[PDB]
Design a protein around this ligand. Structure first.
Ligand SMILES: O=C(O)[C@H](Cc1ccccc1)Oc1ccc(Cc2ccccc2)cc1
Lengths: 270, 270
């Protein structure tokens, strides 16, 4: 019954709105869009980052570049702090998906553990355009150039996400569409270690059904949009795999430090 | 008009039968012992192997292998042969996909280059069950266990293909379904280096519509089969990537062995 599907879609949208502060609609207004009423601080250079990190609402380290903590490192570690926040927002959203809390607890943890990275990059694209990505709740904007000019190991960290974003954003999905897509990603079914795959696939089946109707009604002229979005799931997987890769490579840069115990703890691997 | 999509489905199924000598229909009839009009000889150890060249057409070695191209080598030299053969069969099929031959020559080559191995693993599943795979046009059957017991590097080649096969086969697709799915794979558009992406996406869109109708009519009770099939496209990409690194390992261990020219061209790093 299209009734239930349309109902499911609205529910996910409302839940999505309350779990994620920065929506794509908002990010878009700020980005390429005009909506010039409070332009974001732009970070396009070392001086920009420096002469602005003290003026921006960032919570970690202050701008200090002179043989004391490399810029690239501080920026990378900065993305970790934010990803850790996103994880909690995503976890809260997952709990609103009909049926999720009723699943085996271990399976719930497994789905979140393997789905968080794919969701993070999916939503990150909402805050990106070909020229840069929004930062700090949208109060900042770090250029694509400045990021690619960072240290050798770190100058290739965001590029692949930028490439994905450009292609993903070409589908012109809106929040209402994304709310359902993100739920499909969470209720995968092929994650390793799952104990009871049936209820998970049963829910995804219902979610996919809802996603298809949402796309047909919200994008009547976009032929086969459903199929195209689903194929983007292969691009996300590669982004993630490729990501843990550069991560291990970085692991061979910073290691033994008797001052990171409690801090390194808060930031595991995911 | 669904009428035009049905005609396209028929066309592709027709060309598929004409290009691929060993269909899934024939493979299942051979595998399901219920049909013993012509059963396969089974290879599950060295002795069976020796006896294999007896009744089966094996131009390889039968006796000793250690000091004369070991078994593992003989088997993969044979595998290399079938793949090149498979590539030629797929290339022949590609030309029948409406619009393919009318594309920029450079793009035709790029589409085949990236799509060929994804198709091979899809079709290779038609020849597999949880315990082994048909060989030599169905005259033989080599055990999964036998293959996994080969020399350190050679024993890791097939296992992931079997793992893929067992799950892909759970979808219960038949030849008419696969003919359209294979065509969908070839006309990607997100392949690296494409010159004219639009004409490619226009063809894939039409093929996707054809695939969706086919699965709805041929599998009326298989909810979200279309979406489930499309997601399998992520498993294929992974298999290709692992396969490549294994290949790079062999190239360094067997400095006397050679990767066939046609396959060397298709492959590349990164
Ligand atoms: O990579 C390929 O194109 C083929 C693809 C394939 C793999 C499994 C079944 C069918 C086709 O699989 C190969 C795997 C290893 C090798 C290594 C090899 C090189 C020279 C001689 C013997 C083996 C060659 C092909």
């Amino acid at each position: 019954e299209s009734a239930d599907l349309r109902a499911l879609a609205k529910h996910l949208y409302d839940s999505y709105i309350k779990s994620f502060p920065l929506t794509k609609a908002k990010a878009r207004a700020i980005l390429t869009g005009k909506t010039t009423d409070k332009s974001p601080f732009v970070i396009y250079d070392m001086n920009s980052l420096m002469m602005g990190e003290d003026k921006i609402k960032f919570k970690h380290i202050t701008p200090l570049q002179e043989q004391s903590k490399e810029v690239a490192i501080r920026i990378f570690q900065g993305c970790q702090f934010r990803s850790v926040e996103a994880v909690q927002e995503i976890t809260e959203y997952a709990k609103s998906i009909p049926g999720f809390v009723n699943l085996d607890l271990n399976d719930q943890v497994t789905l979140l553990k393997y789905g968080v990275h794919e969701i993070i990059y999916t939503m990150l694209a909402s805050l990106m355009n070909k020229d840069g990505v929004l930062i700090s709740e949208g109060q900042g904007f770090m250029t694509r150039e400045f990021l690619k000019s960072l240290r050798k190991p770190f100058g290739d960290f965001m590029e692949p996400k930028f490439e994905f974003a450009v292609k993903f954003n070409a589908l012109e999905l809106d929040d209402s569409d994304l709310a359902i897509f993100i739920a499909v990603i969470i209720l995968s079914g092929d994650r390793p270690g799952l104990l009871n795959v049936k209820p998970i696939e049963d829910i995804q089946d219902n979610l996919l059904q809802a996603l298809e109707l949402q796309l047909k009604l919200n994008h009547p002229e976009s032929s086969q949009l459903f199929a195209k979005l689903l194929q983007k799931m292969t691009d996300l997987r590669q982004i993630v795999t490729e990501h843990v890769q550069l991560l291990q490579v970085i692991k061979k840069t910073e290691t033994d430090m008797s001052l990171h115990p409690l801090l390194q703890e808060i930031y595991k691997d995911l």
